[PDB]
Amino acid sequence: TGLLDGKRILVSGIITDSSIAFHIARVAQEQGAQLVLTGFDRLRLIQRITDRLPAKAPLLELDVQNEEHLASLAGRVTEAIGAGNKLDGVVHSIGFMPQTGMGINPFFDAPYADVSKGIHISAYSYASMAKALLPIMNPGGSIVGMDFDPSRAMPAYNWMTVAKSALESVNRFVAREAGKYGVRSNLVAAGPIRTLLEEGWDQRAPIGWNMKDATPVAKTVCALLSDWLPATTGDIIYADGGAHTQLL
Amino acid sequence: TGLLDGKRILVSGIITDSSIAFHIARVAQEQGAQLVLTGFDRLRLIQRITDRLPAKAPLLELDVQNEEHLASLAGRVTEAIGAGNKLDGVVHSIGFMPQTGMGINPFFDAPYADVSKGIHISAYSYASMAKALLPIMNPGGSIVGMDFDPSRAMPAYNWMTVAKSALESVNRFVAREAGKYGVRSNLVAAGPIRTEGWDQRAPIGWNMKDATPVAKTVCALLSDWLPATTGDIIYADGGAHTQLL
Amino acid sequence: TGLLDGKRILVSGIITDSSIAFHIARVAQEQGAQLVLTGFDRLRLIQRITDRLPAKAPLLELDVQNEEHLASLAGRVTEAIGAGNKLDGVVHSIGFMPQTGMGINPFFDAPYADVSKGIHISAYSYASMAKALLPIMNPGGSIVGMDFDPSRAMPAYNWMTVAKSALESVNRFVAREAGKYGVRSNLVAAGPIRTGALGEEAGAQIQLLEEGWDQRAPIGWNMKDATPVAKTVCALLSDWLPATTGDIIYADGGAHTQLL
Amino acid sequence: TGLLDGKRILVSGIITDSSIAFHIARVAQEQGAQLVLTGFDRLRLIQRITDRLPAKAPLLELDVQNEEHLASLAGRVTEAIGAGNKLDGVVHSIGFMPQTGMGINPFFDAPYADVSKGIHISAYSYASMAKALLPIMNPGGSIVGMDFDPSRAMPAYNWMTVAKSALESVNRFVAREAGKYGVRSNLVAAGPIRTLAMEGWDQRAPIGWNMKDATPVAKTVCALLSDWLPATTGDIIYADGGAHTQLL
Ligand SMILES: NC(=O)c1ccc[n+]([C@@H]2O[C@H](COP(=O)([O-])OP(=O)(O)OC[C@H]3O[C@@H](n4cnc5c(N)ncnc54)[C@H](O)[C@@H]3O)[C@@H](O)[C@H]2O)c1
Ligand SMILES: NC(=O)c1ccc[n+]([C@@H]2O[C@H](COP(=O)([O-])OP(=O)(O)OC[C@H]3O[C@@H](n4cnc5c(N)ncnc54)[C@H](O)[C@@H]3O)[C@@H](O)[C@H]2O)c1
Ligand SMILES: NC(=O)c1ccc[n+]([C@@H]2O[C@H](COP(=O)([O-])OP(=O)(O)OC[C@H]3O[C@@H](n4cnc5c(N)ncnc54)[C@H](O)[C@@H]3O)[C@@H](O)[C@H]2O)c1
Ligand SMILES: NC(=O)c1ccc[n+]([C@@H]2O[C@H](COP(=O)([O-])OP(=O)(O)OC[C@H]3O[C@@H](n4cnc5c(N)ncnc54)[C@H](O)[C@@H]3O)[C@@H](O)[C@H]2O)c1
């Protein structure tokens, strides 16, 4: 009997076998959660990657920028686990920022039309996903989305950082709204995962940080999807090896 | 002499006499500062507003959602202050958020498009004014923005907090760019300024019919008296954010 | 299985059956933990509270201002759990501050001697216990202490608020040390828990913090149930928050994340 | 003229001319304030150090660990500054922590008795000075303290960091009391400076940072003593070149 017995859990973000949405989904099922998976564009590719999970699940199409996808979303999830069954958990593990405002491109050279699409998919779609799903969730349930410490600036991360800071604010409001269903909303701020800054991360981490290992981040999302943190919401747990709390 | 003596400062945001920007300029001039100002929609009416500010200042047009105003800014300023002179300070007192994304209007019924218009103007616009004016700014310069503390969610402000949360991030990134020029970038988290509880939590009280202390603090950031603060946030809130109860 | 199975956890800070430490322990066992308890002063009276847990476990003396108690704690634990065995968890649920620096007493009227007793017991102890129990802990182990968000000033808490701020700083440092041993260090900030006797002002002021907490916490908050705090602590002691240390998890209904 | 013209202000912490208090005093005087100066032990050397200040100034004694120096503080100042008058500003720039609680000595080996003394001098004494000098403080006045960002652990600064976390907590509480007198209390969190015995900082700093130069800090402290940060209390202004706002 693992952490997630009898729990029906939605999981977005699976694109590659190296995705955090993958290791989270794999770990959930490894603990009893019966999963429902969602996918963005390459519907048939990620179908073949989900098949490599310990167990199979009703993968569903979900482009967060498409309004019809959200409207339908809820009722389609009902069809996959059977009507009169609701969701105990949901996982938002999605992000997107065009090269224009993220990476090597100067912070100033990023048009708003590029940034807004970055914030649409990475921040706003947290609320929108909650909106589409709360109605079909059970009390004592959990919504958990991916974060990356944005409280300070850095190279490359540029406007994605600004999207994460948008997310954090969005998390706190979704919590307000989510509380009416007896639902908790939290963010897991992870350390950098392969999918200077990383040689220093593992230094700063008092227990180390292995950027090739996404399992320690998944275990932490399962804890948030479990009943063992029933009094925390609108909040950020940090799975970065303790890096953020260490200057040098 | 004044605190902003012989520093040429740009001040946006003015729309009425209550307006944060209005008091900021007002004090800046009292502090011997030679100003430049920018206005948004009702340009014509806002000249009958800028008239009261002690001295005469060149009211240039600026719309942070308009790409052309931005490209022509440095040229429309450099000329206002005469070729050969650059700015020493920049003030962004600009915010907007459609009604659907605020107040009693549910959080989830805000269409992205409204929220997007709100981020562009309230958060992104800070980076775009910086891009436009860093090239014509002197070393020892200071850029400043108006912030409303978004660390915690609250009633009514809704997506504006999200725009404010985005704005604080952006600010840190503007500070990197401005560093290349020896120019600083900071926000001022103001308490309510009308355009009970706060007066309570605030150990020195708080008066939301009075914008001068907020206005004063924006002047300090423009001064040479905080030469080591950058990509940071100063609270002009009567210390309310520092008290639980 | 149980969430904490075959884990040898040392719990500290049980004085009455309302103690947070009593429910951390009560839950710990429901979830399979094998416990070693530490008690402070009235050592006889607390035996009679520990009896009434899910299961009887060894009570040990630990006056964390006694340097002798620390130098012998590790051997006394090892002895209680059997040679060859080591602790997998430690819980610091200890705190103290005189009426002088906490209550209706003016902030400026707490003589430094009292404050110092409070800081020793409420913050420094965390570094001592950690120092004493770390050499007998398995890699993967966990240390958690109880905290109460000192970020902002408030009425009454006064100098204990300062102790908590020092405790958070001491936590961050302890993490550095326990990491060598493969042990995580974390604190749990809990909303206020039932653990006008003071008077008109206090019975009101404090009646306002419990009116306010429920209000602000988006999933509400119950001043009478320490169970959700006990579950939070069990999740730090578990293998399901292994990437997190020197940090603070907030089991307070999410109230600290809301302004009103 | 000056920023602090004709303001009666006290300043503690001067032991050499490298001291942050010396440059806070120096600039305070370059701006036309009248100063009272306190000194811990080497009174005949802080004497000889202070001669070399823009204007001559009263140097009364004050070991903040002495109940009597504190008990007699208000009256000794009220004499130096003359009867009928009061202070407009107070500068706590005091801090100390035994060898044991810093540097190469292992964080676990500091006896509380050492930790305790350093918290007494660095953190607690701020409430004392506030307590001692507040009945002799005019409305619109201002208390300020020196801080080093203790929000994340680091090596070496060790137990002093715990003292600074405490001092910040103390700062917010001293503001409660200060407001009653119409006064503000604030810390200036400074970047490292070459003091008698006290890199990445100048790198992280968007505007860089020189640790042999304390003038930016004194300018900051003065800006808290001025009338130009009137809305700011219980808070912490960072004079560190934006360092803390960046990660790399
Ligand atoms: N990997 C890291 O180093 C790291 C660290 C901290 C946080 N994060 C965050 O974790 C989350 C997971 O990302 P990842 O690291 O696994 O990268 P990833 O590329 O594997 O996953 C990102 C996902 O976002 C999805 N996506 C993009 N646009 C979408 C849309 N319109 N609708 C639905 N889905 C869309 C992609 O399809 C993809 O599955 C992201 O939010 C990211 O910001 C990643
Ligand atoms: N009033 C407060 O309690 C308070 C508190 C903290 C922060 N602030 C911030 O201070 C700033 C100014 O607010 P205020 O209280 O002076 O109100 P205000 O009405 O006087 O100022 C708002 C300004 O936003 C400008 N604006 C909107 N859209 C624009 C666009 N497309 N292009 C250019 N300008 C545009 C308007 O012209 C106006 O000048 C805002 O950013 C606000 O968030 C206000
Ligand atoms: N009750 C709340 O709302 C609340 C909220 C947040 C945090 N906490 C924290 O939980 C912890 C325990 O609080 P509680 O509510 O269980 O109260 P409690 O009175 O039941 O526990 C305090 C414990 O400290 C122990 N103690 C005192 N002096 C000691 C000494 N020097 N050596 C060893 N132990 C000593 C006592 O024996 C007692 O068990 C404290 O750290 C407190 O700050 C309580
Ligand atoms: N230099 C830095 O890297 C740095 C950075 C941030 C903050 N600070 C802070 O600035 C403040 C002043 O230190 P500094 O950098 O000028 O170095 P410093 O050595 O020149 O100043 C230390 C002062 O503390 C005083 N002091 C010690 N015991 C005292 C006592 N019992 N009573 C009264 N005063 C006592 C000393 O007399 C001395 O004047 C300290 O609080 C320090 O922590 C320093």
Short mmCIF file of C-alpha atoms in Angstrom, two decimals, chain C residues 145-254:
data_model
loop_
_atom_site.label_atom_id
_atom_site.label_comp_id
_atom_site.label_asym_id
_atom_site.label_seq_id
_atom_site.Cartn_x
_atom_site.Cartn_y
_atom_site.Cartn_z
CA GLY C 145 11.74 20.98 14.56
CA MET C 146 8.62 23.03 15.23
CA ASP C 147 8.52 26.62 14.08
CA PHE C 148 5.97 29.51 14.08
CA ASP C 149 6.53 31.93 11.16
CA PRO C 150 8.59 34.82 12.73
CA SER C 151 8.68 36.85 9.41
CA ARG C 152 6.47 39.57 10.75
CA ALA C 153 6.07 41.16 14.17
CA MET C 154 2.90 40.54 16.16
CA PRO C 155 1.41 40.99 19.61
CA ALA C 156 2.39 38.79 22.53
CA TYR C 157 4.78 36.31 20.87
CA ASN C 158 7.40 39.06 21.51
CA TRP C 159 10.83 37.44 22.10
CA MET C 160 9.78 33.88 21.22
CA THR C 161 9.32 35.44 17.72
CA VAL C 162 13.08 36.23 17.82
CA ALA C 163 13.85 32.72 19.04
CA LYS C 164 11.97 31.36 16.04
CA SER C 165 13.88 33.63 13.63
CA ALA C 166 17.16 32.41 15.19
CA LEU C 167 15.79 28.79 14.97
CA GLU C 168 15.19 29.17 11.23
CA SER C 169 18.82 30.48 10.80
CA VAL C 170 20.10 27.68 13.01
CA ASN C 171 18.07 25.17 10.89
CA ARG C 172 19.81 26.32 7.66
CA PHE C 173 23.18 25.78 9.33
CA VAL C 174 22.29 22.43 10.86
CA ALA C 175 21.35 21.28 7.31
CA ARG C 176 24.97 21.89 6.12
CA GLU C 177 26.27 19.59 8.88
CA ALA C 178 23.59 16.77 8.71
CA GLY C 179 24.07 16.62 4.92
CA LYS C 180 27.56 15.09 5.32
CA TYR C 181 25.80 12.22 7.16
CA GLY C 182 23.08 12.07 4.41
CA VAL C 183 20.53 13.64 6.78
CA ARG C 184 18.01 16.36 5.97
CA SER C 185 17.13 19.21 8.33
CA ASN C 186 13.79 20.98 8.05
CA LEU C 187 11.33 22.94 10.28
CA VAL C 188 7.51 22.82 10.42
CA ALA C 189 5.71 26.15 10.75
CA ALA C 190 2.31 25.32 12.21
CA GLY C 191 -0.74 27.49 12.68
CA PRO C 192 -1.70 28.17 16.28
CA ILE C 193 -2.68 25.04 18.29
CA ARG C 194 -4.58 24.67 21.71
CA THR C 195 -1.50 24.06 23.92
CA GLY C 196 -8.43 34.88 29.16
CA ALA C 197 -6.11 33.54 31.86
CA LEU C 198 -3.90 36.47 30.95
CA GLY C 199 -6.79 39.00 30.92
CA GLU C 200 -9.17 41.22 28.90
CA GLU C 201 -6.50 42.38 26.40
CA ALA C 202 -4.93 38.91 25.87
CA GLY C 203 -8.20 36.96 25.75
CA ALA C 204 -9.20 39.41 22.96
CA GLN C 205 -5.83 39.83 21.12
CA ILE C 206 -5.32 36.04 21.05
CA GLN C 207 -9.07 35.56 20.19
CA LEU C 208 -8.25 37.66 17.11
CA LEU C 209 -5.31 35.54 15.91
CA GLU C 210 -7.57 32.40 15.87
CA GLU C 211 -10.43 34.40 14.24
CA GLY C 212 -7.87 35.59 11.69
CA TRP C 213 -6.16 32.28 10.97
CA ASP C 214 -9.30 30.36 9.99
CA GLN C 215 -10.31 33.38 7.87
CA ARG C 216 -7.05 33.69 5.93
CA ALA C 217 -6.21 29.97 5.46
CA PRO C 218 -7.82 29.11 2.07
CA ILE C 219 -8.58 25.58 3.32
CA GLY C 220 -9.54 26.84 6.75
CA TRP C 221 -7.78 26.01 9.99
CA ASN C 222 -8.70 24.17 13.19
CA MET C 223 -7.07 25.47 16.44
CA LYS C 224 -8.10 22.16 18.23
CA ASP C 225 -6.55 19.43 15.94
CA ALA C 226 -2.73 19.04 15.86
CA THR C 227 -3.10 15.99 13.64
CA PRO C 228 -2.47 17.74 10.29
CA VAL C 229 0.79 19.13 11.89
CA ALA C 230 1.70 15.60 13.04
CA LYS C 231 1.08 14.27 9.51
CA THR C 232 3.31 17.08 8.05
CA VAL C 233 6.17 16.08 10.42
CA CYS C 234 5.75 12.38 9.44
CA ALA C 235 6.10 13.37 5.78
CA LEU C 236 9.52 15.02 6.61
CA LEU C 237 10.59 11.97 8.50
CA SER C 238 9.52 9.84 5.48
CA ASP C 239 11.15 9.13 2.10
CA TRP C 240 8.71 11.46 0.27
CA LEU C 241 10.46 14.82 0.78
CA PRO C 242 14.08 13.62 0.22
CA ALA C 243 15.26 16.54 -1.91
CA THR C 244 14.34 19.18 0.66
CA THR C 245 16.50 20.48 3.52
CA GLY C 246 17.43 23.61 5.46
CA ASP C 247 13.88 24.63 4.59
CA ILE C 248 10.44 25.29 6.10
CA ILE C 249 7.21 23.46 5.30
CA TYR C 250 4.08 25.33 6.31
CA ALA C 251 1.24 23.37 7.93
CA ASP C 252 -0.98 26.36 8.67
CA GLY C 253 -3.90 26.13 6.22
CA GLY C 254 -1.83 28.26 3.87
#
